[PDB]
Design a protein around this ligand. Sequence first.
Ligand SMILES: c1cc2c(cc1Nc1ccc3nnnn3n1)CCC2
Ligand SMILES: c1cc2c(cc1Nc1ccc3nnnn3n1)CCC2
Lengths: 238, 239, 244, 229
Amino acid sequence: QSMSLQGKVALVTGASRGIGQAIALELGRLGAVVIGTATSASGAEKIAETLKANGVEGAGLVLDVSSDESVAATLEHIQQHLGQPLIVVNNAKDDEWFDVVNTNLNSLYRLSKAVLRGMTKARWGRIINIGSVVGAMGNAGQTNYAAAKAGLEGFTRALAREVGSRAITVNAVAPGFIDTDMTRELPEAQREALLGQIPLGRLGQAEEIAKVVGFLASDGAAYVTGATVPVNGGMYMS
Amino acid sequence: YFQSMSLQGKVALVTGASRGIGQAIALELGRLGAVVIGTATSASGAEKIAETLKANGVEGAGLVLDVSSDESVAATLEHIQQHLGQPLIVVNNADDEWFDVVNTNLNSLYRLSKAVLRGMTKARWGRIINIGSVVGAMGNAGQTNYAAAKAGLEGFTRALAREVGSRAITVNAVAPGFIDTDMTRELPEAQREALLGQIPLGRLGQAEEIAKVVGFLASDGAAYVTGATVPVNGGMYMS
Amino acid sequence: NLYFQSMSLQGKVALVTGASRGIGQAIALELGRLGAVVIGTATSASGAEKIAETLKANGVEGAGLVLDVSSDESVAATLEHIQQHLGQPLIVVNNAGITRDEWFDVVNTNLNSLYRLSKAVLRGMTKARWGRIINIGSVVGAMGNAGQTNYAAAKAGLEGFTRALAREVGSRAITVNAVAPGFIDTDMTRELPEAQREALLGQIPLGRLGQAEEIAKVVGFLASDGAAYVTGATVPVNGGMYMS
Amino acid sequence: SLQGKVALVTGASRGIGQAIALELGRLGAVVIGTATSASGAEKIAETLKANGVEGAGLVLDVSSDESVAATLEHIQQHLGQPLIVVNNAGIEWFDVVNTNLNSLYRLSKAVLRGMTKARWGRIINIGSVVAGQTNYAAAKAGLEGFTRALAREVGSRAITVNAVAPGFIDTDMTRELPEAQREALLGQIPLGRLGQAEEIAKVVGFLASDGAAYVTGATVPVNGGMYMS
Ligand SMILES: c1cc2c(cc1Nc1ccc3nnnn3n1)CCC2
Ligand SMILES: c1cc2c(cc1Nc1ccc3nnnn3n1)CCC2
């Protein structure tokens, strides 16, 4: 009812595995037509296969969120074949933090500004930003993780204010320690130490991030905007 | 009858359920299949709750509960246990006044939460959800009261979530902004227009729109969300 | 023939609770060093006598008294005594928090004590149209889960409390601020095994424990006239380790 | 005492910047204040002279790698390394915030070599004074996280990095504000008044002192009790 996304087109970047894949499946399951992206032709073909195997109408595409040209072209392709995406989920050393965060926010900003025209026309939108998963070792890692998270929060809160009068919401999801291919390959010691800091005593599932995204994308979340919802089993960092 | 991904057969306790946000929450949990026990402080309010639930096809009851009283809490829970089973979803709903107000709210949450925890601990499953106050008065006293309550609620929610997390019980809160309620309808027209201008969405929130967030947090999909305060405020953030 | 100090708090009376050791003692010495007349408190006669001796040994004019911040009577009586003998305390540092399902009762008890003491001292500050109330948060003392829960709860309650009281009293030129210590060096943490120490320090960008004096300096500043537009703030003093 | 220390304060020709330069001077620092025009830099030199403060006034464009490097070199030749650096000079929310942080990062990275050598430093970032609310909150969030991160990167070198978040301060921008906006602002400030530029400077002076050595990664709000989310 509120939870139906029937008749909506959703763009989910970095959808070939993990949290991205799970998000694309959840939006599909809720009735959306889903366009998942990857950076390689191989990843984009994998996305198309996964969507087919789950009954989800849509497609898999190649997108480089760092490139104005790729963005504009990808959106054009979506417009030609399926219509305007009105749900967009952005998923995709210690001197590094400043350049990393800056690059992420430019990518969000590029993609968000591009998809906004269609949302502005429609007078309806959902932009949802996925923060980074926990598990990078040492002080350099924690520095990079906290910087990214602070930049994402403020970015999300600001963009929400800019576009709010158009009935477009902008929210973010801050994952904690989630069971993914990248975290499975973490050394066992780092993992056990992470696990011990989580009140729920387990890793989160990728589906458990996707469910939050699915809700935020629904009509029932229409008065939620500028928010960063943490999904972390009770483990909070400053 | 055996449920899957639904609130069916779960018993939910929603306090202050006679009107506004509380009522809407009770209806949403009912709609999602829960057996719902709504509470009020008066016999009259509790009867109103029972009627409203009946009129909407929701199985459950309306009861009298004084969350300031250890006796009333224990007695109310016993009655629920006898008739319907242990409530595994619990929604707590309800410038020099701020200290007493916040203090009283948190003692009431703590009392009720501690009481319902034994049943959740046995079941190895639970959902406690705390509703913050609505943005309800325009002056300085109001904004002070609202920010104090909200800060106390956030930290309380985060702490309890840590205490009970290992038992697969989640504890979250919902921080409403400016919601269309009897309290806010009676605000002067001049204050309303000035309110709306501080809200990016340009409108009041509906009580249903708080209830939908609560319904989601109560679901299985929200199992990895705990200690969180979800703001539902149309983009107006105020501390 | 009377000696007039040129220090920032000359001619002010300061009340510092829980002043018998650690951060409290250091705060009392700093305010004294900055020229304040200083009344340090403890819960026992022996602690109050220790305070008086320490103050005397450091050239600080003032006293050591017994105060139980959990008791309305003790608070009122202690204030009256201070008024009679030395004058109204217009700088008040609340240090004396407790410790030891426990988090809720601890935090609640602290905030009632702050509120009691703050309300009592406010009459003198309201008359004077000037005040400084400064609340000291708890030291990082437990690295598990129960400890981190207690520490974050206390800190959140203190922050909102501080911010709210600041609003209530602001129009009277009284400021209300808090100081949130991180890992501060004490006799108990020096005796931690060398292995646990190195692992702790690796969480702190500065790579060292804070000194009690380093909390006291921040308190001394917030107490000054230059800090008059700082109110409702919680200043973290933690060497860059932020945890919540 | 900041006796024997060299301080670089950008945007020092008026307001908060000027007051910061005078406070650091008063505390004994040799002070280099910057402005974007020759005229502003000359004004700074005059103001410093008139107050007994040793130092200089220079032209600096924090958006330019060349100007930064050259300015530092000039300071090094004549006075020695600045070990206290106050970034005051800042300037569609997205482009503004991004530009500020690049400037902070540029200037901070440049001054860090001298601080790393000395094994001592103080970097202090001044936030913006109170569409507008969006810009202000974005800037403040970016500043906080920036300040907290840089503090972690440089902490082991006994360099602290902190920020000051002003509220409604009596300055050129705010003097021109309409009476209606002012009165509405005052009513949201518990202290019931504007802050003085000196009152920001005093916080900066303290953060620059040895007694603030265990404070790092902090943003100290100086706003009379008015807080915005
Ligand atoms: C642009 C816009 C907005 C923000 C940040 C940027 N740019 C950067 C760049 C680096 C960085 N490090 N930590 N944060 N941060 N932020 C946050 C509020 C909106
Ligand atoms: C009173 C006033 C205010 C606050 C808290 C209380 N009382 C309690 C009591 C318990 C508790 N646990 N976590 N927080 N918390 N707070 C914070 C905002 C102002």
